[PDB]
Amino acid sequence: HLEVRDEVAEKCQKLFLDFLEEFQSSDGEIKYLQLAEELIRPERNTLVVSFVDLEQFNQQLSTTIQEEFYRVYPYLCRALKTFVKDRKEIPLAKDFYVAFQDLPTRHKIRELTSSRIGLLTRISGQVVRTHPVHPELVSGTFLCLDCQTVIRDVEQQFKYTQPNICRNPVCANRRRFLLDTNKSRFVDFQKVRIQETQAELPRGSIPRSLEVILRAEAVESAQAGDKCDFTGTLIVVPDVSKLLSYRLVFLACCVAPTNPRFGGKEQTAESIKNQMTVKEWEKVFEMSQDKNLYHNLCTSLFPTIHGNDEVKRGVLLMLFGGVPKTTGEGTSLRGDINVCIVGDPSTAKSQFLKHVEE
Amino acid sequence: NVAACKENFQRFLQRFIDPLAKEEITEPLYMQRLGEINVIGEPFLNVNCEHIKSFDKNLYRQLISYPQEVIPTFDMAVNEIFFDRYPDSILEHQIQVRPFNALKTKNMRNLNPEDIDQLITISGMVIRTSQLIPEMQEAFFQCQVCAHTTRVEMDRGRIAEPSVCGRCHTTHSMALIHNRSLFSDKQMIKLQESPEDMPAGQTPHTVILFAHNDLVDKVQPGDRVNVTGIYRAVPIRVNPRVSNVKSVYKTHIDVIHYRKTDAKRLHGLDEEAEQKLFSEKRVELLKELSRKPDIYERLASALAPSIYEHEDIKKGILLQLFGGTRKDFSHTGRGKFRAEINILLCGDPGTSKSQLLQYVYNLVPRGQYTSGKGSSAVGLTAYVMKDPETRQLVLQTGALVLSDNGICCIDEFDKMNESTRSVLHEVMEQQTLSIAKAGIICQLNARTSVLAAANPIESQWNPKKTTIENIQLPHTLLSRFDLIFLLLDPQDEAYDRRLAHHLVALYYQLDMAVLKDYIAYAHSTIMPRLSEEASQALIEAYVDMRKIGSSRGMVSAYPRQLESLIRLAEAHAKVRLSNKVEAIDVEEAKRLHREALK
Ligand SMILES: [Zn+2]
Ligand SMILES: [Zn+2]
């Protein structure tokens, strides 16, 4: 009569809860007990566990995540609701989300077959559109109507799903329940569309595209025109009008830029002079103190262009930019300079432009 | 019907001998195929369902008449004759069987309803494909009371719900869990009958094919295939609500086997892994033919064996089929570097220009043929169409991007108003295309190579004017070409006589597979790198070109030409497999560049 132990899920929940506490950084000082500190102030509800460290601390586990990532996701999030009760100031009905990152092996939008649903993959692409953010109902609390009881903790699956059984032997409406909406559990939900990156296009082909669904505190990381790198699971989705026809959808959990120009983590002189690694800052100083700098940026930016010494200088002064000012009335002075080139055929015009744009 | 057929098929698979030749008697033909399947991956067995017509005639009736109740038997009866190599190599998926036919069987217009659900072969030209579509195989239910998860199979072609929890018995509590079930793939493709084999004065049809699990992405739009597969017809419903189905069914084709034998063309660039699949008997032939002192003039003179002499134009159009090296300039931040050659043919009428385009277009695979007035600015590169269903603007590809590996023959080059002519400036020099329209901001790229043909202004080459006035093209467009062939041909009483004597002969009555394979080889395993003796003849060859082209007023020379020489020089070295550019490979491709404008 009583429910069944989904053992492969609960054993994994247990080992993950253990890993969260035992794993420590280079100097003891358990690291997922300090990143999980800011997880209490409002608006933060995603802990970002690296996946390579879960490889160090354990390996009979990684092969369970990376193969059942959809079965065992509803448990790797409860095992974060218990690990964070040691703060006592979280609202008791608040819920948290685990977000992996730094998977070893990548994939391509054309390798996303139907033999990959329910697993843990990683995808790179561009971003074309971004719809608006919405709430989405994860677990409704149906206020019963005749019993005036509360049927509780009913999970939706892509529809409203209207659970129809009451634990009251006298429930006059097994087809009528008015759910409340001030106790139920909502999560943000944004749906964007990504397009195959440029360096993967097979020659003579139009680029494919798919729908990714950001569903957490991660809800406005990706904007249009960016080249993010999503890491979640591929799922199938019905056609809810007739609830068949199925269509593939990517269900991302983490999203990060594909190649960070500064590998630390991603706005004045000091905020940036903080992130400068020792060699970075001992080199920038060396350059700023360099004499004849104004001739070693030209010779080092356009190394394959003989002559036109009066054009490279202008291009540099265009790259550095002037000071943008705002008059008190409300107008504004232009801060950056514009530059036009005009010349005979084959005089290295498009070469300056290609240099600057690359 | 089931046991009686595997026993009759194993025999065929074991004892069969043919009066034929394969891969350039070794009796165990299909046993040798089955051995190759074991020494490598790829668990598919391409059986010809005509060999089974010689060995037998009472299975060849039951394979093309009950193909879906037979082909499983043809899989099982192959798994067991895999006993020889059972212990040696143990792959995982299964072994397969794929009947086909060397020659077509029907058209797209003579498919009759006595042929529903029986093996059928047609041929066409794939137009467009679609993205993958899942398709359920094994359901996965779960109760809300007992939380017990049964896994029912789809056997007949529908999924049935159990309605009784094996533990709690609530008589309907078993929901369907989607993302815990098992799916397979399915793609939708559209054929189009070839121009040959269609009736008098009619328009091509289309036929919808459905691919499946493993054939799911084995074909591209623009390919000519011989699809073989069952022919089915399924009902449709007038409402998506009621069960009132129509009475006129709707047909498609569950494909089973492709075949892209394009011997009328060369080798497309899907067969670079297949170049390692050359008989070592053939590499000797190629390397030895590449040693004769004139293999250049011996291959060139074998292009289009119907044009008269025109000796230089065939040289240029032969070097265009190899192209310079593909160097990797990502480090120098320069960008990329074009490696293909653009050729322009200008000359007074009757001189057989359009015949050369019509010949090349029919030789190279992945090509196009365009004209002057019947092509617009956006139709050549990329347009934006209001997609009909979703009512959204979506991007599409023109002609200069569909070629992308091959040649884009543009006849009637003069008669294109200057708007649609200034579009080629990007795609023919940088090998790119930057689009910025309503919602689409992207950057395509292609590896095409134009081959254009024009007429002089006034359509008559009058020698009173200067060479830069009979062509009447700008300089920012004439420099993107690197071989401007001026077919200056008058009424030479000797030339006309020889040509007529040649043309009449076509009314009474080297190989290809040497050229068709020499080209694949010389593409696969060659990369000419310059030298220091060659590089020292390339500097002066550009310092003289300036003084020459400056005065005459014919066609000036800009530094871009100095790159073209490279493009030409290297392309010559590839002809003889020399893998290293030396002096003579610059003198040849300099004499070619000079003796075309005279
Ligand atoms: Zn009730
Ligand atoms: Zn049950």
Side-chain angles (χ1 to χ4, degrees):
Chain A
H1 200 64
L2 55 95
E3 77 268 343
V4 178
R5 297 293 91 195
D6 204 333
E7 293 275 327
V8 190
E10 291 180 357
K11 153 171 162 294
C12 185
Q13 157 193 338
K14 153 192 172 186
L15 272 75
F16 186 75
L17 175 51
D18 212 335
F19 151 77
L20 262 172
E21 317 169 315
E22 293 305 318
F23 185 81
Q24 75 191 37
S25 60
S26 60
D27 51 354
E29 193 172 313
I30 294 95
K31 56 184 305 186
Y32 294 129
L33 203 50
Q34 303 165 318
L35 299 182
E37 286 298 275
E38 272 311 301
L39 192 62
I40 187 171
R41 70 152 195 247
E43 91 198 5
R44 286 288 315 268
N45 44 0
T46 57
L47 182 73
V48 49
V49 53
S50 173
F51 194 89
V52 71
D53 302 356
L54 193 148
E55 299 191 14
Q56 316 309 93
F57 179 86
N58 202 330
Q59 203 157 341
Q60 270 279 340
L61 194 63
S62 298
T63 314
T64 313
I65 301 312
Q66 209 159 351
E67 309 279 353
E68 319 298 319
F69 180 71
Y70 201 68
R71 285 190 52 183
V72 306
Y73 200 67
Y75 297 90
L76 298 197
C77 292
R78 286 202 276 275
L80 197 48
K81 189 186 298 177
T82 73
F83 170 81
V84 77
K85 274 177 166 49
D86 303 334
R87 313 309 307 280
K88 209 55 186 58
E89 311 146 1
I90 57 175
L92 268 42
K94 188 180 177 177
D95 41 357
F96 301 88
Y97 300 118
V98 160
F100 293 95
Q101 82 174 21
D102 265 326
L103 274 167
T105 176
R106 213 200 303 273
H107 270 67
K108 320 170 186 176
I109 310 198
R110 272 186 164 88
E111 305 190 42
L112 294 189
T113 81
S114 186
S115 91
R116 290 292 265 169
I117 84 163
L119 306 203
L120 182 73
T121 70
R122 173 178 173 191
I123 289 310
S124 168
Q126 278 209 21
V127 180
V128 171
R129 306 186 184 196
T130 48
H131 296 233
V133 193
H134 284 151
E136 170 212 9
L137 173 82
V138 294
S139 87
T141 300
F142 281 15
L143 157 67
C144 187
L145 186 59
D146 80 316
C147 310
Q148 266 55 51
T149 54
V150 290
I151 304 180
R152 200 176 161 188
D153 315 330
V154 294
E155 292 184 4
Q156 285 63 13
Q157 197 162 6
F158 314 124
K159 208 202 164 185
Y160 185 81
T161 74
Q162 48 164 111
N164 49 57
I165 306 303
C166 189
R167 299 177 176 178
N168 198 27
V170 180
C171 186
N173 48 331
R174 271 199 200 176
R175 297 199 179 194
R176 294 184 178 180
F177 301 110
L178 170 70
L179 87 173
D180 84 319
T181 45
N182 44 19
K183 181 170 169 48
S184 274
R185 293 166 68 254
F186 292 103
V187 71
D188 306 71
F189 168 101
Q190 192 186 63
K191 177 189 64 173
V192 317
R193 146 156 299 168
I194 80 173
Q195 160 200 78
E196 191 160 11
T197 197
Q198 195 256 335
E200 285 173 13
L201 269 169
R203 307 193 333 270
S205 278
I206 51 172
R208 285 187 187 173
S209 84
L210 52 76
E211 316 85 325
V212 319
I213 292 188
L214 322 175
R215 205 182 26 88
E217 204 208 331
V219 78
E220 281 185 351
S221 299
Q223 299 295 342
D226 271 298
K227 311 187 185 308
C228 303
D229 177 314
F230 311 92
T231 168
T233 173
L234 193 88
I235 65 180
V236 77
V237 163
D239 189 8
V240 310
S241 158
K242 308 177 179 181
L243 205 170
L244 273 176
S245 89
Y246 291 109
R247 60 194 189 95
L248 294 184
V249 170
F250 203 68
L251 185 92
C253 73
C254 177
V255 50
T258 179
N259 47 4
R261 289 91 187 87
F262 290 128
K265 183 52 151 81
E266 177 62 30
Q267 300 178 359
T268 173
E270 301 316 273
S271 54
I272 277 179
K273 203 193 154 188
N274 282 23
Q275 311 155 27
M276 310 270 282
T277 294
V278 175
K279 298 180 182 178
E280 306 175 344
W281 175 241
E282 293 177 350
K283 182 51 163 301
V284 168
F285 188 87
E286 163 166 1
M287 263 184 304
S288 158
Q289 298 292 150
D290 199 74
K291 69 177 198 61
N292 305 64
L293 179 68
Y294 182 56
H295 194 79
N296 295 141
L297 288 185
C298 305
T299 310
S300 54
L301 211 58
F302 320 99
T304 68
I305 294 181
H306 162 266
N308 306 350
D309 268 310
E310 299 290 343
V311 178
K312 315 184 189 176
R313 293 190 169 102
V315 161
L316 268 187
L317 304 190
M318 188 208 64
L319 279 174
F320 271 133
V323 186
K325 308 171 176 179
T326 313
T327 64
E329 306 184 12
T331 66
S332 276
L333 315 172
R334 191 192 68 183
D336 40 24
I337 75 175
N338 307 340
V339 165
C340 165
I341 318 186
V342 168
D344 274 319
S346 185
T347 42
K349 284 190 282 294
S350 304
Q351 280 305 325
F352 288 120
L353 276 74
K354 284 188 160 298
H355 279 185
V356 164
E357 78 91 14
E358 67 81 21
Chain B
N1 187 29
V2 53
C5 188
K6 51 181 57 184
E7 307 196 292
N8 299 320
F9 176 70
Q10 291 149 327
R11 305 197 68 261
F12 164 82
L13 191 150
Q14 297 181 346
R15 55 177 72 258
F16 200 90
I17 306 89
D18 60 333
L20 310 189
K22 73 188 191 311
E23 55 163 6
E24 309 264 15
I25 192 57
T26 73
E27 173 275 314
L29 206 162
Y30 286 157
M31 309 275 290
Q32 274 171 320
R33 297 299 203 189
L34 196 55
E36 262 195 356
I37 294 316
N38 161 78
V39 64
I40 60 192
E42 299 100 352
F44 321 120
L45 183 59
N46 291 27
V47 57
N48 186 331
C49 77
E50 177 271 353
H51 292 352
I52 78 173
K53 190 188 177 185
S54 304
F55 180 86
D56 194 320
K57 277 209 59 180
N58 201 260
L59 50 77
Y60 181 66
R61 147 175 294 172
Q62 303 207 19
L63 177 55
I64 83 166
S65 161
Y66 301 78
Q68 75 277 27
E69 277 205 357
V70 166
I71 292 186
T73 284
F74 282 15
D75 307 289
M76 290 182 175
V78 174
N79 292 282
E80 311 306 329
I81 323 295
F82 211 47
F83 218 102
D84 312 334
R85 291 89 179 190
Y86 272 159
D88 264 318
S89 80
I90 298 94
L91 53 89
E92 68 277 60
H93 297 89
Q94 207 58 279
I95 205 54
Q96 288 293 341
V97 52
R98 296 184 173 180
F100 72 95
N101 299 279
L103 295 174
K104 84 154 69 176
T105 296
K106 301 166 170 52
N107 312 71
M108 298 180 181
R109 301 179 167 275
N110 307 342
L111 288 178
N112 299 324
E114 61 261 25
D115 297 10
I116 292 174
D117 199 319
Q118 88 172 37
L119 211 77
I120 273 169
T121 315
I122 57 186
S123 49
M125 166 81 162
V126 174
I127 294 182
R128 58 203 49 177
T129 68
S130 70
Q131 299 184 32
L132 266 41
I133 305 170
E135 154 181 284
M136 186 178 302
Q137 292 184 354
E138 297 198 22
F140 179 108
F141 289 86
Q142 177 203 59
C143 165
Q144 300 299 326
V145 173
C146 60
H148 169 68
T149 61
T150 178
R151 193 186 320 265
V152 51
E153 172 75 31
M154 166 191 290
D155 182 58
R156 174 63 56 167
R158 189 52 180 181
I159 278 289
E161 197 274 310
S163 171
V164 164
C165 312
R167 301 215 305 106
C168 69
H169 321 263
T170 307
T171 76
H172 58 64
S173 64
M174 308 290 290
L176 167 55
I177 301 302
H178 299 260
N179 314 76
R180 294 282 305 285
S181 60
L182 286 170
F183 293 94
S184 44
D185 276 300
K186 200 183 67 175
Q187 198 181 70
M188 189 202 84
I189 312 171
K190 286 184 51 183
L191 255 68
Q192 196 200 61
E193 42 171 345
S194 275
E196 58 187 10
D197 308 61
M198 78 188 306
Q202 293 179 14
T203 301
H205 279 173
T206 72
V207 192
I208 294 92
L209 331 171
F210 282 109
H212 272 306
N213 49 20
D214 203 325
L215 303 147
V216 78
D217 219 335
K218 294 285 152 44
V219 81
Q220 309 265 335
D223 267 319
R224 295 174 187 84
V225 301
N226 278 78
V227 54
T228 297
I230 310 165
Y231 175 81
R232 307 192 190 278
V234 305
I236 51 188
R237 305 190 297 179
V238 62
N239 281 320
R241 277 85 193 281
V242 310
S243 71
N244 272 315
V245 307
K246 280 158 173 288
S247 192
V248 184
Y249 271 43
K250 167 203 58 185
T251 63
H252 63 248
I253 285 187
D254 293 17
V255 61
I256 287 189
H257 166 97
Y258 289 111
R259 196 210 83 177
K260 292 189 292 185
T261 299
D262 289 345
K264 293 179 179 179
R265 337 214 111 295
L266 295 174
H267 284 286
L269 264 295
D270 201 340
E271 294 89 311
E272 181 174 358
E274 286 309 334
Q275 193 272 316
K276 297 181 174 183
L277 281 301
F278 278 169
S279 76
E280 195 58 20
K281 305 159 288 188
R282 260 292 197 177
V283 179
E284 320 195 339
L285 275 161
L286 308 186
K287 284 166 174 167
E288 72 94 16
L289 292 161
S290 45
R291 298 192 189 106
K292 312 186 175 186
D294 43 343
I295 181 60
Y296 193 32
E297 311 177 353
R298 192 191 175 191
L299 273 186
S301 300
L303 281 188
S306 278
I307 320 294
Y308 200 47
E309 46 190 359
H310 271 158
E311 65 183 63
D312 270 0
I313 305 195
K314 300 172 184 183
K315 303 259 200 62
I317 297 183
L318 176 69
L319 295 182
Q320 194 179 44
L321 296 188
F322 286 133
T325 41
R326 308 196 300 259
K327 306 172 187 64
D328 192 75
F329 287 144
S330 54
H331 196 267
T332 40
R334 164 193 181 84
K336 43 188 52 65
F337 166 75
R338 193 185 90 218
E340 291 87 4
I341 317 185
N342 308 327
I343 293 183
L344 177 58
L345 308 178
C346 177
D348 54 2
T351 41
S352 178
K353 292 182 292 297
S354 305
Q355 287 292 336
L356 273 168
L357 310 200
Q358 283 272 36
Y359 172 69
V360 156
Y361 159 61
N362 293 315
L363 172 65
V364 67
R366 281 301 282 255
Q368 299 289 341
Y369 187 92
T370 311
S371 174
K373 296 302 298 180
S375 87
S376 74
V378 309
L380 287 175
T381 57
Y383 49 102
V384 160
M385 66 184 311
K386 169 195 180 66
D387 185 285
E389 301 72 21
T390 186
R391 291 323 205 196
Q392 292 206 351
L393 304 186
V394 304
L395 193 82
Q396 297 298 338
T397 37
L400 271 166
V401 188
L402 290 181
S403 83
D404 166 73
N405 210 317
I407 300 197
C408 173
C409 303
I410 307 179
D411 210 337
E412 297 288 330
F413 196 87
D414 188 338
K415 303 169 186 47
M416 297 159 54
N417 43 352
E418 198 61 30
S419 69
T420 172
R421 189 187 302 162
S422 57
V423 159
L424 321 184
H425 288 175
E426 192 170 10
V427 198
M428 91 187 306
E429 161 68 6
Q430 305 160 338
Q431 310 269 100
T432 196
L433 175 67
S434 301
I435 307 162
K437 277 171 188 172
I440 314 299
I441 299 187
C442 70
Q443 168 164 353
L444 276 63
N445 48 5
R447 285 194 175 172
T448 170
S449 57
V450 192
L451 166 61
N455 283 330
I457 208 165
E458 179 63 287
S459 47
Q460 186 78 40
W461 184 275
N462 63 330
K464 256 170 165 48
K465 305 166 66 182
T466 43
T467 309
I468 189 61
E469 284 291 351
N470 301 146
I471 311 182
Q472 213 67 46
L473 295 181
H475 279 91
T476 88
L477 175 60
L478 275 181
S479 87
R480 287 149 206 271
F481 296 99
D482 47 29
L483 286 179
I484 304 181
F485 282 123
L486 295 174
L487 275 66
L488 295 174
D489 289 345
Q491 300 80 354
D492 289 345
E493 293 177 350
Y495 176 56
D496 304 350
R497 293 182 183 174
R498 293 182 183 174
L499 168 62
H501 204 63
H502 163 89
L503 266 182
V504 177
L506 301 190
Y507 272 71
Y508 324 131
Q509 176 254 333
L510 200 61
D511 209 331
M512 268 294 300
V514 50
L515 169 79
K516 184 185 193 301
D517 281 348
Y518 195 92
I519 286 190
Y521 182 66
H523 276 167
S524 161
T525 81
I526 291 284
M527 223 75 59
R529 282 273 167 266
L530 276 73
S531 90
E532 184 266 299
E533 283 294 3
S535 156
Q536 202 48 45
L538 271 183
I539 295 180
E540 311 151 351
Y542 170 69
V543 188
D544 65 350
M545 270 188 166
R546 298 280 276 177
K547 300 170 183 173
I548 288 174
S550 43
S551 61
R552 320 266 66 81
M554 55 177 71
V555 284
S556 312
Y558 309 115
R560 184 180 269 122
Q561 268 64 242
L562 184 48
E563 313 176 351
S564 167
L565 279 183
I566 297 173
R567 262 191 277 277
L568 279 173
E570 309 179 346
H572 183 199
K574 292 193 176 186
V575 185
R576 49 172 200 162
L577 309 174
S578 163
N579 212 331
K580 170 202 60 178
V581 169
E582 67 150 8
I584 85 171
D585 285 3
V586 167
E587 272 77 43
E588 157 66 14
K590 177 167 71 81
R591 193 262 315 174
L592 186 50
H593 195 297
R594 172 179 69 251
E595 311 298 331
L597 284 144
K598 298 183 180 182

